[PDB]
Structure formats: structure tokens, C-alpha cells
Design a protein around this motif. Structure first.
Motif, mmCIF file in Angstrom:
data_model
loop_
_atom_site.group_PDB
_atom_site.id
_atom_site.type_symbol
_atom_site.label_atom_id
_atom_site.label_comp_id
_atom_site.label_asym_id
_atom_site.label_seq_id
_atom_site.Cartn_x
_atom_site.Cartn_y
_atom_site.Cartn_z
ATOM 1 N N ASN A 51 73.670 -38.034 37.206
ATOM 2 C CA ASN A 51 74.023 -37.137 38.285
ATOM 3 C C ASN A 51 72.929 -36.278 38.871
ATOM 4 O O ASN A 51 73.142 -35.125 39.187
ATOM 5 C CB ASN A 51 75.210 -36.264 37.869
ATOM 6 N N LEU A 52 71.760 -36.852 39.018
ATOM 7 C CA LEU A 52 70.653 -36.166 39.672
ATOM 8 C C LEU A 52 70.378 -36.747 41.058
ATOM 9 O O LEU A 52 69.260 -36.636 41.574
ATOM 10 C CB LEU A 52 69.409 -36.218 38.783
ATOM 11 N N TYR A 53 71.386 -37.375 41.671
ATOM 12 C CA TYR A 53 71.197 -38.093 42.929
ATOM 13 C C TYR A 53 72.116 -37.596 44.048
ATOM 14 O O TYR A 53 72.326 -38.316 45.028
ATOM 15 C CB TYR A 53 71.396 -39.593 42.703
ATOM 16 N N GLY A 54 72.655 -36.381 43.941
ATOM 17 C CA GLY A 54 73.488 -35.815 44.985
ATOM 18 C C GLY A 54 74.955 -36.126 44.768
ATOM 19 O O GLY A 54 75.341 -36.897 43.890
ATOM 20 N N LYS A 55 75.805 -35.505 45.587
ATOM 21 C CA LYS A 55 77.238 -35.707 45.415
ATOM 22 C C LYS A 55 77.847 -36.662 46.432
ATOM 23 O O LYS A 55 79.003 -37.065 46.251
ATOM 24 C CB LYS A 55 77.991 -34.372 45.471
ATOM 25 N N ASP A 56 77.106 -37.047 47.475
ATOM 26 C CA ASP A 56 77.649 -37.931 48.502
ATOM 27 C C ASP A 56 76.508 -38.631 49.233
ATOM 28 O O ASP A 56 75.325 -38.327 49.037
ATOM 29 C CB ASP A 56 78.538 -37.157 49.487
ATOM 30 N N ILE A 57 76.903 -39.556 50.111
ATOM 31 C CA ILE A 57 75.957 -40.406 50.834
ATOM 32 C C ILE A 57 74.970 -39.565 51.623
ATOM 33 O O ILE A 57 73.773 -39.867 51.669
ATOM 34 C CB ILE A 57 76.718 -41.387 51.753
ATOM 35 N N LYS A 58 75.457 -38.506 52.272
ATOM 36 C CA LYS A 58 74.586 -37.677 53.099
ATOM 37 C C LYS A 58 73.595 -36.884 52.251
ATOM 38 O O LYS A 58 72.453 -36.657 52.668
ATOM 39 C CB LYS A 58 75.429 -36.732 53.959
ATOM 40 N N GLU A 59 74.012 -36.423 51.068
ATOM 41 C CA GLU A 59 73.044 -35.754 50.200
ATOM 42 C C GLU A 59 72.022 -36.728 49.641
ATOM 43 O O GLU A 59 70.865 -36.351 49.469
ATOM 44 C CB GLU A 59 73.735 -35.027 49.054
ATOM 45 N N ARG A 60 72.420 -37.977 49.364
ATOM 46 C CA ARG A 60 71.442 -38.967 48.926
ATOM 47 C C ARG A 60 70.409 -39.217 50.011
ATOM 48 O O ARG A 60 69.222 -39.396 49.716
ATOM 49 C CB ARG A 60 72.133 -40.276 48.535
ATOM 50 N N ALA A 61 70.848 -39.220 51.276
ATOM 51 C CA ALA A 61 69.925 -39.383 52.395
ATOM 52 C C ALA A 61 68.830 -38.321 52.364
ATOM 53 O O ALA A 61 67.648 -38.638 52.515
ATOM 54 C CB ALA A 61 70.686 -39.324 53.723
ATOM 55 N N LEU A 62 69.213 -37.045 52.215
ATOM 56 C CA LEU A 62 68.213 -35.982 52.148
ATOM 57 C C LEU A 62 67.306 -36.185 50.950
ATOM 58 O O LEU A 62 66.076 -36.152 51.076
ATOM 59 C CB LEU A 62 68.880 -34.605 52.078
ATOM 60 N N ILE A 63 67.900 -36.410 49.775
ATOM 61 C CA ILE A 63 67.103 -36.671 48.572
ATOM 62 C C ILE A 63 66.158 -37.846 48.803
ATOM 63 O O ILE A 63 64.961 -37.767 48.512
ATOM 64 C CB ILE A 63 68.024 -36.915 47.366
ATOM 65 N N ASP A 64 66.683 -38.949 49.348
ATOM 66 C CA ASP A 64 65.842 -40.117 49.613
ATOM 67 C C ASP A 64 64.686 -39.772 50.541
ATOM 68 O O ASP A 64 63.546 -40.177 50.310
ATOM 69 C CB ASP A 64 66.672 -41.244 50.230
ATOM 70 N N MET A 65 64.975 -39.066 51.634
ATOM 71 C CA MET A 65 63.912 -38.723 52.568
ATOM 72 C C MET A 65 62.851 -37.889 51.876
ATOM 73 O O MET A 65 61.648 -38.149 52.015
ATOM 74 C CB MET A 65 64.516 -37.988 53.765
ATOM 75 N N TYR A 66 63.289 -36.896 51.089
ATOM 76 C CA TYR A 66 62.358 -36.020 50.384
ATOM 77 C C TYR A 66 61.493 -36.800 49.412
ATOM 78 O O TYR A 66 60.272 -36.665 49.409
ATOM 79 C CB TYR A 66 63.121 -34.944 49.622
ATOM 80 N N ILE A 67 62.122 -37.601 48.549
ATOM 81 C CA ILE A 67 61.372 -38.221 47.466
ATOM 82 C C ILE A 67 60.517 -39.360 47.966
ATOM 83 O O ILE A 67 59.528 -39.695 47.314
ATOM 84 C CB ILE A 67 62.306 -38.707 46.347
ATOM 85 N N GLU A 68 60.861 -39.960 49.115
ATOM 86 C CA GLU A 68 60.002 -41.003 49.661
ATOM 87 C C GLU A 68 58.706 -40.430 50.217
ATOM 88 O O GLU A 68 57.660 -41.082 50.127
ATOM 89 C CB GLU A 68 60.749 -41.801 50.732
ATOM 90 N N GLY A 69 58.746 -39.226 50.790
ATOM 91 C CA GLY A 69 57.499 -38.562 51.137
ATOM 92 C C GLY A 69 56.683 -38.224 49.906
ATOM 93 O O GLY A 69 55.463 -38.420 49.884
ATOM 94 N N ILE A 70 57.343 -37.707 48.863
ATOM 95 C CA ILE A 70 56.668 -37.475 47.588
ATOM 96 C C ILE A 70 56.041 -38.767 47.070
ATOM 97 O O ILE A 70 54.888 -38.782 46.627
ATOM 98 C CB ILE A 70 57.652 -36.875 46.573
ATOM 99 N N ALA A 71 56.783 -39.877 47.130
ATOM 100 C CA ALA A 71 56.243 -41.148 46.640
ATOM 101 C C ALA A 71 55.048 -41.608 47.465
ATOM 102 O O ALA A 71 54.093 -42.173 46.918
ATOM 103 C CB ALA A 71 57.328 -42.224 46.634
#
Length: 221
Positions: free
Chosen positions: A79-99
């Protein structure tokens, strides 16, 4: 259930962010280190590496390769990946810049030496002008202690791991981003991360010249 088993070199490389994520989630895991070309050949030949490369993580009956596949699964499971599709989108956008920035820093050592100063110069410039302003802006926009959903996510873990690497590279780069400093401090004080940062954990040290040169030999790259 089965305890996750990480196959990698005894090095940070491409497995370190998985070590951070599991440790921050409080999940016990063990490591099987690849010490020789023979070790790698055996994992390949026996069929355990889909694309003939490590990292490889055994977890929940699967033999996962590809860092992003490994991290994506672990983050959902715990459960470190957000609570819904839209929160995963933000997480994905953030961590892809980090990557993206992490990939640059990851590859600076094997950068040819005649081009290494300009690679570093460019990296430092993207940190100060592209990446650190973007995360400071996120943190300032909601003022909360975590990047997304007011709740610890993989984004905080991946970001703060990168903050440690950027410190190693140049302590001054974070100096004008007070909210990143505050994040680094708070995340580092979560009990699981605090333990990971203490000695004796699986956290790995920076690559040194002897270790790099020797591994270049053994694994021919």
C-alpha cells in the motif's frame, strides 16, 4: 509467506531503490549476491532471468525482473502506491522524473572520462533548475508532510533516496529548497527508514574505484 529474495551484485546499482522500498515498508528480505560471471551465467542458463539480466526478485511465487516491475508490485502489495488510479498517476509522474534523474546519476561513473565533467555539469544544472524546483513546488502547494494523499507513498521513499545521492554528489544543491530538506529529515525519522539508515542494514555504499574497476573486469562491461 515466502520472504522476498533479491538477486543482484553486492552493490547499489539497480537494486538499491528496491532495498529502500522494502525496508521502508518494514518487510524482511534476504539477498543472494552475484560475485562472479559464473553466478550470472547460472541464473541466465537456468531460466530465472526473463531478459538475461538482474535485478531479479523472488516474491510471492514469481521471479520478477525489470526494476520498474519489481518496484510497482512491491508498492501495491504494501500500500505505498496511492488509493486510486488518479493518485497513482501523480505518484507515477513524480517517480518517473526521479527515475530519469536517478538514471543519469546512476551512469556517471561509467561515463567516458573525457565527457564526464560536462555530464556532471549538466546533471547539477537539471537538479537545480528542473527537478528540485518541481518537487519543492509540489510540497509548497499543499504544505503536507507527504508528496501525495497526505500519506507515505513510494514517491516519498524514492525521492528521499535520491536526496541522499544528491548530497553525496554536492551538498549545496539542496540548500535553496527548504521543503526538500524538511522531507529528507522527516522520512529519515520514520522508524523503518531510520533503521535502514543505521549501520548493519542492507543499504549499500557508493561504488568506489577499486570495486568498479574489478567488476568491469569480472562482468566485462
Amino acid at each position: 509467506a515466502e520472504k522476498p529474495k533479491l538477486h543482484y551484485f553486492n552493490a547499489r546499482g539497480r537494486m538499491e531503490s528496491t532495498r529502500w522500498l522494502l525496508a521502508a515498508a518494514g518487510v524482511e528480505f534476504e539477498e543472494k549476491f552475484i560475485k562472479s560471471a559464473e553466478d550470472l551465467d547460472k541464473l541466465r542458463n537456468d531460466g530465472y532471468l526473463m531478459f538475461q539480466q538482474v535485478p531479479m526478485v523472488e516474491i510471492d511465487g514469481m521471479k520478477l525482473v525489470q526494476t520498474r516491475a519489481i518496484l510497482n508490485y512491491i508498492a501495491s502489495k504494501y500500500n505505498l502506491y496511492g488509493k486510486d488510479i488518479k493518485e497513482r498517476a501523480l505518484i507515477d509522474m513524480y517517480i518517473e522524473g526521479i527515475a530519469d534523474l536517478g538514471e543519469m546519476i546512476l551512469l556517471l561513473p561509467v561515463c567516458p572520462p573525457e565527457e564526464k565533467d560536462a555530464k556532471l555539469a549538466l546533471i547539477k544544472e537539471k537538479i537545480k533548475n528542473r527537478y528540485f524546483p518541481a518537487f519543492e513546488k509540489v510540497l509548497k502547494s499543499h504544505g503536507q508532510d507527504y508528496l501525495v494523499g497526505n500519506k507515505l507513498s513510494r514517491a516519498d521513499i524514492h525521492l528521499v533516496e535520491l536526496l541522499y545521492y544528491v548530497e553525496e554528489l554536492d551538498s549545496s544543491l539542496i540548500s535553496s529548497f527548504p521543503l526538500l530538506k524538511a522531507l529528507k529529515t522527516r522520512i529519515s525519522n520514520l522508524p523503518t527508514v531510520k533503521k535502514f539508515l543505521q549501520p548493519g542494514s542492507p543499504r549499500k555504499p557508493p561504488m568506489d574505484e577499486k570495486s568498479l574497476e574489478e567488476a568491469r573486469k569480472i562482468f566485462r562491461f
